[PDB]
Amino acid sequence: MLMPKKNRIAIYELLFKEGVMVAKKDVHMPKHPELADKNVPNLHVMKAMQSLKSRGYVKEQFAWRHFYWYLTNEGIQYLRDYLHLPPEIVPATLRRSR
Amino acid sequence: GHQQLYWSHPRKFGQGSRSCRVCSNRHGLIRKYGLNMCRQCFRQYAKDIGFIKLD
Amino acid sequence: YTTPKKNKHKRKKVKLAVLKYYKVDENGKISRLRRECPSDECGAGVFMASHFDRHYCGKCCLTYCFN
Amino acid sequence: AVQISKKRKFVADGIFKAELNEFLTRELAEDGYSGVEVRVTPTRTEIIILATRTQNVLGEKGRRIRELTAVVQKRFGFPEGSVELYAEKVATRGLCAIAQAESLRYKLLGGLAVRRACYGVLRFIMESGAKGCEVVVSGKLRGQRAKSMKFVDGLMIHSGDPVNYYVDTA
RNA sequence: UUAAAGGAAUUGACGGAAGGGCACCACCAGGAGUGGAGCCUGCGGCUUAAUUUGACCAACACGGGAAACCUCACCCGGCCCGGACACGGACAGGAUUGACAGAUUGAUAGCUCUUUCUCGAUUCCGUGGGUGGUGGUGCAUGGCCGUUCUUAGUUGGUGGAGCGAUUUGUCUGGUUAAUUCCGAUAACGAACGAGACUCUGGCAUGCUAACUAGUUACGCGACCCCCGAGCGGUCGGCGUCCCCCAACUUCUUAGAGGGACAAGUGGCGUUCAGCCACCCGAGAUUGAGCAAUAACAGGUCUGUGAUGCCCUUAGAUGUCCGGGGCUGCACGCGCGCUACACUGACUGGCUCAGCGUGUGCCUACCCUACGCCGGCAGGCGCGGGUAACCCGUUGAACCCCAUUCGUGAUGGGGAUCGGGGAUUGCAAUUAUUCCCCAUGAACGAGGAAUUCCCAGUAAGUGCGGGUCAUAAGCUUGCGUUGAUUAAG
Ligand SMILES: [Mg+2]
Ligand SMILES: [Mg+2]
Ligand SMILES: [Zn+2]
Ligand SMILES: [Zn+2]
Numbered sequence: 001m002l003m004p005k006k007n008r009i010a011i012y013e014l015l016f017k018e019g020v021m022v023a024k025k026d027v028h029m030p031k032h033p034e035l036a037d038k039n040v041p042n043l044h045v046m047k048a049m050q051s052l053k054s055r056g057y058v059k060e061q062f063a064w065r066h067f068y069w070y071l072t073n074e075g076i077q078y079l080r081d082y083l084h085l086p087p088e089i090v091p092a093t094l095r096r097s098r
Numbered sequence: 099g100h101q102q103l104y105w106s107h108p109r110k111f112g113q114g115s116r117s118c119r120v121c122s123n124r125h126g127l128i129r130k131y132g133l134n135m136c137r138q139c140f141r142q143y144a145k146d147i148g149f150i151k152l153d
Numbered sequence: 154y155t156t157p158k159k160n161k162h163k164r165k166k167v168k169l170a171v172l173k174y175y176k177v178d179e180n181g182k183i184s185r186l187r188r189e190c191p192s193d194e195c196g197a198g199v200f201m202a203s204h205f206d207r208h209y210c211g212k213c214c215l216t217y218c219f220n
Numbered sequence: 221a222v223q224i225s226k227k228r229k230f231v232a233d234g235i236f237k238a239e240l241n242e243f244l245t246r247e248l249a250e251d252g253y254s255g256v257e258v259r260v261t262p263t264r265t266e267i268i269i270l271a272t273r274t275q276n277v278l279g280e281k282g283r284r285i286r287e288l289t290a291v292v293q294k295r296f297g298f299p300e301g302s303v304e305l306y307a308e309k310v311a312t313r314g315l316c317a318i319a320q321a322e323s324l325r326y327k328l329l330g331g332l333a334v335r336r337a338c339y340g341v342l343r344f345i346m347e348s349g350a351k352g353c354e355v356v357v358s359g360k361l362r363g364q365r366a367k368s369m370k371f372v373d374g375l376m377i378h379s380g381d382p383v384n385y386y387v388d389t390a
Numbered sequence: 391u392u393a394a395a396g397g398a399a400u401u402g403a404c405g406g407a408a409g410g411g412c413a414c415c416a417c418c419a420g421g422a423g424u425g426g427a428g429c430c431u432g433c434g435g436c437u438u439a440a441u442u443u444g445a446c447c448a449a450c451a452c453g454g455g456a457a458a459c460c461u462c463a464c465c466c467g468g469c470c471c472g473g474a475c476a477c478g479g480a481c482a483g484g485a486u487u488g489a490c491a492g493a494u495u496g497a498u499a500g501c502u503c504u505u506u507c508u509c510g511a512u513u514c515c516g517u518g519g520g521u522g523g524u525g526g527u528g529c530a531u532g533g534c535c536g537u538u539c540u541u542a543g544u545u546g547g548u549g550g551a552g553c554g555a556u557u558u559g560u561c562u563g564g565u566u567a568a569u570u571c572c573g574a575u576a577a578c579g580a581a582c583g584a585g586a587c588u589c590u591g592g593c594a595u596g597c598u599a600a601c602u603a604g605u606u607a608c609g610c611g612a613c614c615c616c617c618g619a620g621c622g623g624u625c626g627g628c629g630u631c632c633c634c635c636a637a638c639u640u641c642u643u644a645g646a647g648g649g650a651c652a653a654g655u656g657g658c659g660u661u662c663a664g665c666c667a668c669c670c671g672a673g674a675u676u677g678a679g680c681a682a683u684a685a686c687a688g689g690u691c692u693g694u695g696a697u698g699c700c701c702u703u704a705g706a707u708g709u710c711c712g713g714g715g716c717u718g719c720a721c722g723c724g725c726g727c728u729a730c731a732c733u734g735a736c737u738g739g740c741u742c743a744g745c746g747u748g749u750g751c752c753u754a755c756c757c758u759a760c761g762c763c764g765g766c767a768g769g770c771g772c773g774g775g776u777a778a779c780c781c782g783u784u785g786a787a788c789c790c791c792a793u794u795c796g797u798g799a800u801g802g803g804g805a806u807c808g809g810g811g812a813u814u815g816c817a818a819u820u821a822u823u824c825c826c827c828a829u830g831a832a833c834g835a836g837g838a839a840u841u842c843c844c845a846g847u848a849a850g851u852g853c854g855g856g857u858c859a860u861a862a863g864c865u866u867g868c869g870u871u872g873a874u875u876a877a878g
Contacts, residue, residue, distance in 0.1 A: 001471090001472070001512090002487075002512065002513080003511090003512040003513075004512065005510080005511085005512065008512085018287070018290055018294075019287050019290075020287050020290045020291050020294060021294070022291055022294040022295045024752090025122075025695090026752090027472060028105050029752080033751095033752090034294060043472065046472080047472070047474080050472095050474050050475090051474060051475075052474095053474075053475090054474045054475035054476090054520080055474095055475070061243060061246050061247060061695095062246075062695050063239070063242065063243045063246070063295075063695095064119060064120045064121075064239055064242060064243075064695095065119060065120075065122060065695095066295055068243070068291045068295075070287055071287075092286065092290070093283055093286070093287065094280075094281075094283065095281050096286075097282075097286060099469085099470050099471080099472090099710095100469075100470075100499060100500090100501095102498080102499085103469090103497085103498095103499075103710090103711065104469090104470075104709095104710060104711080105710070105711090106710090106711070107459075107460060107710085107711070107712095107816085108459095108460085108815095108816060109460070109753095110460090110753090110754065110755090110815090110816090110859080111754080111755070111814090111815075111858090111859040111860085112459085112460060112461075112815095112858090112859070112860095113457095113460075113461050113857095113858095114459085114460030114461050115460080115461095115753075115754095116461095116753085118693085118694085119235075119752090120239075120694085121693070121694050122693095122694075122695090123692095123693050123694075124460090124461060124462095124693095125453085125454090125455080125461080125524095125692085125693060126453085126454055126455085126693070126857095127693095128454095128856085129750095129856095129857090129858090130747095130855085130856070131227055131228050131231045132228050132231060132232070132750065132751095133231060133235070134753095135235075136693060136694075137454060137693080138454095138534085138690095138693045138694075139693075139694070141534075142533095142534090142694090143235075143238040146234065146237060146238040146241060147231065147234040147235065147237075147238060148230065148231075148234045148237075149234075150589095151589090151679070151680080152588070152589050152590085152678065152679040152680075153380075153381040153384070153587080153588040153589060153679055153680055155705095156705045158705090159705085160468095160501095160502095160705055161502075162502085164500080164501090164502080166486080166487095167505095167506085168484085169484085170483085170484045171483095171484075172484080187506095187507080190507090199507080199508065199509095200507065200508085201507075202490080202505090202506050202507040202508090203506070203507080204490095204491080204505060204506060204507090205505075205506095207490085207491075208507090209489085209490050209491080209506075209507065210490085210507080210508090211488085211489065211490085211506080211507035211508035211509090212488085212489090212507085212508050212509080213508095214488090214489060214490065214508095215490085216490045216491075217490095219491075222749085222776070223776065224749085224750080224776055225748085225749095225776040225777070226776080226777085227747090227748095227776090227777095228750090228776085229776095232751095246695095297751070352581095358531090358532070358533090359531065359532060360530065360531060360532095360698080364530070365529080365530080365531095365687080366530070366531055366532085374581095375580090375581050375582075376581090376582080377582080378582070378583070378680090378681060378682060379582095379583070379584090379587090379680055379681035379682080380585095380586075380587045380588075380679095380680065380681080381587055381588040381589090381679090381680075382586095382587065382588090383680080383681090384588090384680095
């Protein structure tokens with residue numbers, strides 16, 4: 001899209017602390033509810049996750065009006081390199097509940 | 099873009115703002131009881147809502 | 154089907170390939186040539202504009218008088 | 221905040237119930253979904269799936285529940301610690317119509333003859349202890365004009381109220 | 391010159407062919423009408439920059455489509471990219487964002503331009519490839535729906551008949567709303583539809599239970615009262631689960647069970663099914679839902695991240711914004727409102743309902759009591775209600791009683807049109823609606839033709855949902871008043 005560097009790390013850090021993010025199909029909403037703190041319009045939330053599909057890192061289902069997304073493991077080894085994270089940090093995907 | 103007047107017409111009162119939560123249409127939708135579904139849309143899920151017919 | 158009026162181009166920028174905003178004498182000298190912006194943020198940081206007479210803070214869109 | 225009226229309590233939970241039924245159709249169709257059933261409590265609320273292949277909905281130490289616990293949680297306004305999922309096997313896989321309608325979907329995606337494939341699921345319900353079943357396959361079969369082939373077997377009612385609970389449609 | 395022409399049988403469809411049945415989407419007997427008038431609204435036509443469009447019993451108040459803009463496609467213009475990825479280039483010694491000012495616009499669109507500051511790999515460019523579409527194709531489809539089709543109809547198994555398509559089962563007859571039953575019988579046993587069923591309505595002074603329903607009794611308060619009493623009369627005035635300063639369920643709301651089966655009794659009928667009468671009874675046919683087999687080249691790709699294929703993809707059919715149109719009128723048609731008056735219209739009294747809906751995740755805005763301003767719409771202050779808790783005991787209209795008017799296009803009728811006042815809204819002009827004064831048009835019961843209906847029915851009369859910021863002449867529900875005709 002236009003891809004500001006502050007908001008991409010703002011959406012990736014939640015998209016890596018859990019393996020999901022739950023945007024809704026309306027571009028005319030200037031406030032994503034689950035971030036709600038760095039004045040993202042969810043254009044940036046859409047058009048990031050468009051790019052994550054085309055590399056094959058994320059997955060999506062298109063509910064009634066909601067997009068759901070999921071982390072493939074090739075996305076996790078992509079986000080642990082792009083967020084510069086050491087190879088012990090894993091999301092709530094693998095085993096965080098017993 | 100040029101955000102001052104991209105989406106500047108007021109989507110407020112009137113059928114330029116009501117939409118189907120389920121189908122994404124603006125025509126014929128039912129705003130009774132806070133449903134906001136498309137009328138064509140309403141028939142599918144009406145058994146799942148809990149709306150029975152006469153039998 | 155025709156489009157007679159020719160909407161002419163997109164926006165391609167000015168493409169001026171030199172910075173050079175600090176003149177130097179006497180073997181090393183700090184000297185401004187454009188005014189700095191009087192905002193709360195960029196004192197002696199990002200410049201204020203140098204028009205033929207007036208000055209304008211480019212980042213936060215405040216302006217000086219036409220003089 | 222302020223709570224809304226009992227008329228619009230009961231259409232909110234139904235459209236809660238209708239919404240996740242539509243998503244969990246889209247996700248678990250390749251894993252034999254066959255419905256959900258909800259429990260609202262003033263605690264953790266407990267949502268149980270009725271999947272046939274409960275092996276496939278479980279991830280490696282249960283990944284594909286825990287992200288599917290979250291997409292319900294991070295949409296329908298549940299705080300951290302109020303909603304959970306359970307996978308449960310439906311008894312008689314070949315007796316609820318939602319189950320094997322998706323089975324003969326993914327039999328048709330294997331490139332089978334439609335007449336050979338529909339017989340085997342027609343045979344599957346009737347040998348599973350049913351009272352009657354019929355399958356209508358309608359669309360563009362071999363031919364340019366579309367046509368429908370029905371494969372009725374057994375006996376089956378059509379009218380009155382007892383076609384509400386003696387039958388299930390898919 | 392030509393690939394059939396023909397013969398016999400079978401199944402349908404049709405017959406201005408018989409026979410038996412049946413339906414107010416059929417008639418009779420009728421009622422109310424519609425068609426005539428003004429207007430409201432859809433359709434054709436014309437006109438247009440555009441008047442976007444889909445549909446011709448089973449299109450035409452239909453797309454729940456009552457469009458100020460948005461919707462929104464169509465027309466005149468003007469921005470934006472929300473063109474993912476993949477490759478090459480551009481690419482720290484100079485890729486790309488944003489923006490004050492001015493001729494520049496319709497526009498405080500850096501749209502562009504003159505000039506110059508600013509943004510930090512984000513992108514930009516070429517080439518492939520996505521993607522979006524209220525773009526095409528409902529004759530490429532799914533799903534849904536309409537219909538032939540509200541009528542009784544449909545199909546196997548196994549036997550019987552035929553070379554066979556097929557047929558018997560599924561019928562002479564009686565009977566039924568009904569292949570409904572009784573019987574007759576190369577059929578026997580079954581299935582579906584019909585029916586049962588579910589919802590609903592009518593009855594239970596019997597059962598259960600009520601400060602979010604009530605009565606009744608009893609306290610209190612007020613008021614009348616021959617005359618002056620009161621266990622007198624009235625009171626939706628107050629209290630009696632407020633910690634007993636009463637009981638109870640008739641009325642109200644349900645829940646369970648009851649109740650009606652053609653049972654009883656005559657008559658008819660093969661004394662078979664059943665029919666016709668009655669008595670008891672609340673009721674001796676309440677009303678609707680679902681609803682088969684096989685089909686329609688029915689409708690809908692403009693309802694849908696249901697979808698194939700094609701088209702188009704940046705000077706974009708994407709999307710946003712400003713205006714305009716969908717309302718334009720020599721005419722024709724279809725739903726419908728108000729009427730043509732005295733069985734009325736006014737004016738003032740008077741007393742009666744039921745179904746239901748009400749403050750929202752996004753999403754702003756709800757129903758309104760009461761008080762005080764206004765001659766009216768309305769304007770404020772102040773409450774209550776997320777509801778058997780408040781509006782509300784929903785003082786609905788017609789009807790009823792007194793008044794005025796007198797057969798005159800009249801005080802019938804209220805179209806048209808001028809001036810004003812308010813509300814909704816970003817905006818009321820091509821009048822949103824409402825209010826006030828004034829203006830006072832056809833219209834005297836409507837030719838041929840044609841529609842719906844037979845009991846709380848037709849019809850009159852209002853009321854509430856939907857649409858809804860503003861709003862109903864439409865629809866879908868309610869009660870009220872209530873029939874004339876008919877059992878063919
Ligand atoms: Mg659609
Ligand atoms: Mg007269
Ligand atoms: Zn500053
Ligand atoms: Zn096309």
